Write a protein that binds this DNA or RNA. Structure first.
Ligand code: NA
Ligand code: NA
Length: 326
DNA sequence: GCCG
DNA sequence: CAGTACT
DNA sequence: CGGCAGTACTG
């Protein structure tokens, strides 16, 4: 790179401020500008040069050269005093901008205030109980041990079940925020009813410690978001996210769960410009949308046995998981 | 915020 | 439904 | 002007 650390650091402060106050589109713009600056080959030195970069318009350019010439951004000095507290609250799993702003308006300023006085959803109480742990990253070797724990439990009652760790893990990062386990079966019918068996097996060995999202009274459950802990000393609580998909959806589910988030959004954006649509379920062609870009007609699912097919069908060069950070 |  | 979450 | 991804739970 990063050849603009002085600049991006200041913009990031402003970006998170907008995000936590709920201004998600302004925050999105800052995010793309900030990445474009982190990615640039040289220090940006001119107004004209700032505008040349994709994701940076006249307004963001002005902020850049103000930092360049003065070493400060005046906008930073006029950020609401609530933003630090809002960010503190919003880092509780299950609480977002709306809840953080409510708690603030209700007078709360600390996690102690929240713990003792605030109304917490079941998820938010769990998030609060694990507040520090949910902000830590684990070494990728620990993600391997968690994936193996889920895989052995799954394969124990169906040996044909395929399990793979996705997200930051599959993208080759040294550390992982959580573990993303995708599960499928190559026959095409077996994946039906496996969450109940898997979750009970993982509970019985004491591996799962809390559940955040888990609809298991239905049968069509798609995801489990919860908390686990490996046995022995020195272990922390880790976020575990599992999805079970039909085999025909494997490549699209793999692509989605591997990410990154920005990479997915970017890929789905491109698909829409081509009258196509990409989700975690499928790549579809002939999608009918109105002038507001909303799906009003279904389209048809395209066969996508591998990730490479999805890229291919979108007219895109393949990109290996480690190359999908942005 | 950016951009078509 | 709005809010929050997943990548 | 207006879209900025497309989904899955919770209550
Ligand atoms: Na949160
Ligand atoms: Na992850």
């Amino acid at each position: 790179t990063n050849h603009n650390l002085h600049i991006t650091e200041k913009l990031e402060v402003l970006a998170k401020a907008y995000s936590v106050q709920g201004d998600k589109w302004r925050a999105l713009g800052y995010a793309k500008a900030i990445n474009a600056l982190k990615s640039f080959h040289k220090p940006v030195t001119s107004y004209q040069e700032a505008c040349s970069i994709p994701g940076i318009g006249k307004r963001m350019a002005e902020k850049i050269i103000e930092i360049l010439e003065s070493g400060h951004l005046r906008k930073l000095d006029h950020i609401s005093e609530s933003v630090p507290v809002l960010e503190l609250f919003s880092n509780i799993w299950g609480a977002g901008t709306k809840t953080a702003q409510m708690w603030y308006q209700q007078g709360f300023r600390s996690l102690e205030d929240i713990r003792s006085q605030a109304s917490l959803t079941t998820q938010q109480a769990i998030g609060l109980k694990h507040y520090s742990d949910f902000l830590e990253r684990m070494p990728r070797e620990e993600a391997t041990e968690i994936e193996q724990t889920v895989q052995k439990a799954a394969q124990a009652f169906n040996s044909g079940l395929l399990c793979v760790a996705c997200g930051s893990y599959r993208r080759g990062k040294a550390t992982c925020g959580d573990v993303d386990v995708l599960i499928t079966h190559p026959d095409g019918r077996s994946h039906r009813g496996i969450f109940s068996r898997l979750l009970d097996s993982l509970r019985q060995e004491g591996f799962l410690t809390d559940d955040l999202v888990s609809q298991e009274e239905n049968g069509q459950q798609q995801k489990y978001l919860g908390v686990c802990r490996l046995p022995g000393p020195g272990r922390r609580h880790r976020r575990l996210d599992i999805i079970v998909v039909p085999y025909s959806e494997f490549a699209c589910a793999l692509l989605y769960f591997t990410g990154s988030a920005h990479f997915n959004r970017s890929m789905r954006a491109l698909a829409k410009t081509k009258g196509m649509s990409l989700s975690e379920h499928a790549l579809s062609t002939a999608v009918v949308r109105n002038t507001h870009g909303c799906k009003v007609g279904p389209g048809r699912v395209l066969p996508t046995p591998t990730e490479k097919d999805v890229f291919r069908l979108l007219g895109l060069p393949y990109r290996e998981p480690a190359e999908r950070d942005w």
